[PDB]
Amino acid sequence: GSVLQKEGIEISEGTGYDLSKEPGAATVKALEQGTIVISYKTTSENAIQSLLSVGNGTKGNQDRHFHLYITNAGGVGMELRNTDGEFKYTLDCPAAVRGRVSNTVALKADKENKQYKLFANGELIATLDQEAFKFISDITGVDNVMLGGTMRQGTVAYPFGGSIERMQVYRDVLSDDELIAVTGI
Amino acid sequence: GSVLQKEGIEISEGTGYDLSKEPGAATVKALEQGTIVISYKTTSENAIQSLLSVGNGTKGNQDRHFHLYITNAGGVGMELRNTDGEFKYTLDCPAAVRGSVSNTVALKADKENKQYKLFANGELIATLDQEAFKFISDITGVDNVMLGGTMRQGTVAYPFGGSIERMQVYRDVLSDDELIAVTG
Ligand SMILES: CC(=O)N[C@H]1[C@H]([C@H](O)[C@H](O)CO)O[C@@](O[C@@H]2[C@@H](O)[C@H](O)O[C@H](CO)[C@@H]2O)(C(=O)O)C[C@@H]1O
Ligand SMILES: CC(=O)N[C@H]1[C@H]([C@H](O)[C@H](O)CO)O[C@@](O[C@@H]2[C@@H](O)[C@H](O)O[C@H](CO)[C@@H]2O)(C(=O)O)C[C@@H]1O
């Protein structure tokens, strides 16, 4: 099963929606691998909108976070960061989703294969293999989980507006076939 | 054989070294796929140092370029950009090289397989697959090739300092085994 799930969460641009106190959030804050699946509708023209983030929101730690994000040009991406000297692993895919319309995206991080895969609307859109595999448990001082933005020194960065229709986070690594199916209509 | 090669080029921080007029530069400016192999020594503490770039250096086109870069913290990466709405395909690998010392890195971009692979000092360090494969020929208005920085609105960005010991650009997609051997 999922370790954290939410449904029907509408977010006013800029505000975010804090998940840090939810049952399961502690698990999400320590993930060594796993899968994130999100259905959403954006109503914002912000250039970078985090759907889900997990990171360190404290002063001086603004480059220590993970987020799965969309853009105002129909892009989908993620960033996994613990300051640039430690790691900055990113995917950014163009023309993968559309903006008002429901989309479903997913990211998996697979420790055994050292691989990250991004899916949108029933398609695998990118794969990253890194010799030095990292995930959330490698970020230093993770203290929050949020929908619709990323906490950076107490400010909601990369603000989303619209609806998080469904969000599920898994410790399990779903198969590509599963993610093609679950991100479809 | 390479389509563009240079050896023994010193570059001070900020200066760059223009290759735009060299025979073969036109080919580099239009690559649909290929391989870049560079041996270098950095003397600079700049956080992002382009070893080789190919892009559009004109005003308002600062997000239209390709570069293969190293960092002050022993990292290696690349960015391939034509404005973020079009594409922004990147790799960034930590603790892959050392400043201390000569290092050799390589990037291949394989159109058939829609794949980019980065190598450093005899190891494959990252692989990127993109559904929408892009390379230099997809960048709009490419007008320069340089060593040791990236031209952005007439300024040398991401400035390298040190020596480009050997730089080769190929239209061919070299094998992983070839790259493991040449970089190690
Ligand atoms: C998702 C993404 O591309 N994020 C970038 C981020 C954004 O480009 C920016 O916040 C708004 O578009 O920029 C990051 O880098 C910044 C640097 O480019 C800038 O020189 O200095 C900034 C600090 O004032 C900041 O470090 C960022 O916000 O961390 C890098 C990130 O990948
Ligand atoms: C290799 C890399 O991370 N390149 C980044 C670049 C560098 O982080 C930065 O130039 C070094 O200081 O930052 C880029 O994004 C910038 C935005 O973060 C910033 O909000 O606005 C800047 C323009 O005034 C700039 O766009 C960049 O320089 O393009 C993104 C790039 O991937």
Numbering used by the authors:
A (entry chain B): 7 to 105, 111 to 196
B (entry chain A): 7 to 106, 112 to 195
The authors write:
Protein ligand complexes were achieved for both 3′SL and 6′SL. Definitive electron density for the Neu5Ac and galactose residues was observed in the 3′SL and 6′SL complexes. Contrastingly, for the 3′SL complex, only partial electron density was observed for the glucose residue in a single monomer, and the glucose positioning indicates that the lactose points up and away from the binding site, without further interactions with the protein. In the 3′SL complex, the lactose positioning would permit further extensions to the carbohydrate chain as would be present in more complex or anchored glycans, whereas these may be blocked in the 6′SL complex. This would provide a degree of specificity towards sialic acid linkage. The C4 hydroxyl group hydrogen bonds to Lys135 and Glu126, the N-acetyl group sits in a hydrophobic pocket formed by Tyr116 and Ile95. The N-acetyl group nitrogen interacts with both Glu126 and Tyr210.
Ruminococcus gnavus is a human gut symbiont wherein the ability to degrade mucins is mediated by an intramolecular trans-sialidase (RgNanH).
